[PDB]
A paper describes a structure:
Mycobacteria have up to five specialized secretion systems (ESX-1 to ESX-5) that transport virulence factors across their complex cell envelope to facilitate manipulation of their environment. One of these substrates, the ESX-1 secretion-associated protein B ([name]; [name]), has been postulated as a structural component of the extended ESX-1 machinery. Once secreted across the inner mycobacterial membrane, [name] oligomerizes into a cylinder-like heptamer, favored by the removal of its C-terminal region and the acidic pH environment of the phagosomal lumen.
An initial low resolution structure was obtained with EspB2-348 and EspK484-729 from M. tuberculosis, on the basis of which a new shorter [name] construct was designed (residues 2–300) while retaining important contact points in the crystal packing. This improved the crystal diffraction and led to a final anisotropic resolution of 2.3 Å. The shell consists of an antiparallel β-sheet with five peripheral α helices. The foot of the snail is formed by a compact helix bundle of three α helices with a loop containing three short helices connecting the foot with the shell. The interaction occurs between α6–7 and the PE-[name] loop of [name] and α9–10 of [name]. Analysis of the [name]-[name] interface by PISA gave an interface area of 652 Å2, ΔG of -11.7 kcal/mol, and a relative low complexation significance score of 0.1. The [name]–[name] interaction could be abolished by either shortening an amino acid side chain of [name] through a K663A substitution or by changing the hydrophobicity of a side chain through a F659D substitution in [name], indicating that both residues are essential for complex formation. [name] binding to [name] prevents [name] oligomerization not only by steric hindrance but also by locking the PE-[name] loop, preventing it to adapt the more open conformation that is required for [name] oligomerization.
Numbering used by the authors:
A (entry chain A): 9 to 84, 113 to 297
B (entry chain B): 484 to 729
């Protein structure tokens, strides 16, 4: 049993963990489903960021409890809710082919989403590497030591769960970026629809064979939009509340013995 | 009771190559009741009969009736089977038969004979005569066309336009725009088709207005005035139908 070990472990557990990312994920294009995915990630990252601050307050309380446990062997306004779910559209309504094309290729095409995914995946890896703060004691033994080891273990398991959720949001943003490049590949490019409209305008003599291509060009666009409405609907990330740290109150002053010779 | 054969005759006549010239999504549907009343409907817009086309004396157009609510007219837009059904529904009659080609007929079968047409069953000559389009959709307007002497034909129309120059036949574009939602089966293609057809209606009307105000021939402005009055009716019906479903 040693007091300076406890006093050091308290400072170690109270110390700053990784800074979570703060940059917002911007929608890859101007389609409604893309914006809905980006806004869901905005809400998920905001709620996660609040819950990580709550875990920081819990580690502060655990450090205070460790200091009071060390003094026993000598002398030294809202709460966390769930994440809101962006309401997403079902099968999409009719949209003009030129308009769908013009919206699909207006934006950063997934750069902000990739930066979001990079930041949250790095954050994942940093919290994973920072779990030696919650290991057992070398010299400190007994009932209070076992209770403190249990509290540290609960904080370790919560931190690892938080890392898994950070990885999940990163993979969500990555998925919407891949879905957008598939949509850019499969949907008719704007130059082709404007050129087709102009080629009907040049020879209305070809008007009886331009219409089966446009229907073809419509149908695809519509597969794209249906899939982009269905697959860019992201589940909100609901983190668990951080477990309460053990509360150890300050002890009464120690009785000096050998007193009264 | 009789004239099922006359119904299939006119049903073959609409289905000729005279006016079914590669229009994507255009088809006709002909139907007759137990009374013997003949009703037709196409799949382009509301109260549309093509240019210079006539219908026989018994024939009612389904999308052109006044005893039928405009909201259930617009509900049946571009879906001509449902149109002749709704015509029979409020007009109290039971449909004896529906004629056409079975691709068009795959939608509905409530006690209907489902008459199928083949490439020999349809002759490729239209050859039918009857009422001009103004007399089919607006016989009130066709009667005050007929009491107008050939000099006073400008009393039916609004004044001569402030532009003396012709407006420009952009109709080959607006028609195209019109055919664009007909390549879709998404919810809301009906309404977009009706908006593009309303723009085609208004431009056609302005062209007929200028055509009557610039010509000096009897039959020529009678064509132009009848065209103007027809597109006046069509623009009004499309505006009411687009407005009633917001």
């Amino acid at each position: 049993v040693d007091q300076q070990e406890i006093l050091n472990r308290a400072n170690e557990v109270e110390a700053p963990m990784a800074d979570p990312p703060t940059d917002v994920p911007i929608t890859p294009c101007e389609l409604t489903a893309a914006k809905n995915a980006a806004q869901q990630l905005v809400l998920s990252a905001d709620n996660m960021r609040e819950y990580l601050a709550a875990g920081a307050k819990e580690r502060q309380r655990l450090a205070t409890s460790l200091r009071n446990a060390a003094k026993a062997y000598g002398e030294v306004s809202a709460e966390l809710t769930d994440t809101p779910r962006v309401a997403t559209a079902g099968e999409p309504n009719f949209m003009d082919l030129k308009e769908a094309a013009r919206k699909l290729e207006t934006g950063d095409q997934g750069a902000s989403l990739a930066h979001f995914a990079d930041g949250w995946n790095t954050f994942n890896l940093t919290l994973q590497g920072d779990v030696k703060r919650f290991r057992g004691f070398d010299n400190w033994e007994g009932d209070a030591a076992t209770a403190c080891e249990a509290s540290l273990d609960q904080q370790r398991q919560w931190i690892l769960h938080m890392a898994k959720l950070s990885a999940a949001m990163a993979k969500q943003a990555q998925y919407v970026a891949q879905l957008h490049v598939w949509a850019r590949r499969e949907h008719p490019t704007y130059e082709d629809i404007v050129g087709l409209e102009r080629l009907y305008a040049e020879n209305p003599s070809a008007r009886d064979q331009i219409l089966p291509v446009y229907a073809e060009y419509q149908q695809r666009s519509e597969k794209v939009l249906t899939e982009y409405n269905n697959k860019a609907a992201l589940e909100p990330v609901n983190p668990p509340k951080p477990p309460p740290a053990i509360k150890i109150d300050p002890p009464p002053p120690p009785q000096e013995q050998g007193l009264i010779p | 009771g009789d004239a099922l054969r006359l119904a299939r005759r006119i049903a073959a006549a609409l289905n000729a190559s005279d006016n079914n010239a590669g229009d994507y999504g255009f088809f006709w549907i002909t139907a007759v009741t137990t009374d013997g009343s003949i009703v037709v409907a196409n799949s382009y817009g509301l109260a549309y009969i093509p240019d210079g086309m006539e219908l026989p004396n018994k024939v009612y157009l389904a999308s052109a009736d006044h005893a039928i609510p405009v909201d259930e007219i617009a509900r049946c837009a571009t879906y001509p089977v449902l149109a002749v059904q709704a015509w029979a529904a409020f007009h109290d009659m039971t449909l004896r038969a529906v004629i056409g080609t079975a691709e068009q007929l795959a939608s509905s079968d409530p006690g209907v004979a489902k008459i199928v047409l083949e490439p020999d069953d349809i002759p490729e000559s239209g050859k039918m005569t009857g009422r001009s389009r103004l007399e089919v959709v607006d016989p009130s307007a066709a009667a005050q066309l007929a009491d107008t002497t050939d000099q006073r034909l400008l009393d039916l129309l609004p004044p001569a336009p402030v532009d003396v120059n012709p407006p420009g036949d952009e109709r080959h574009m607006l028609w195209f725009e019109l055919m664009k939602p007909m390549t879709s089966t998404a919810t809301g293609r009906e309404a977009a088709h009706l908006r593009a057809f309303r723009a085609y209606a208004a431009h056609s009307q302005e062209i007929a207005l200028h055509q009557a105000h610039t010509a000096t021939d009897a039959a020529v402005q009678r064509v132009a005035v009848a065209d103007w009055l027809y597109w006046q009716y069509v623009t009004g019906l499309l505006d009411r139908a687009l407005a009633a479903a917001c």
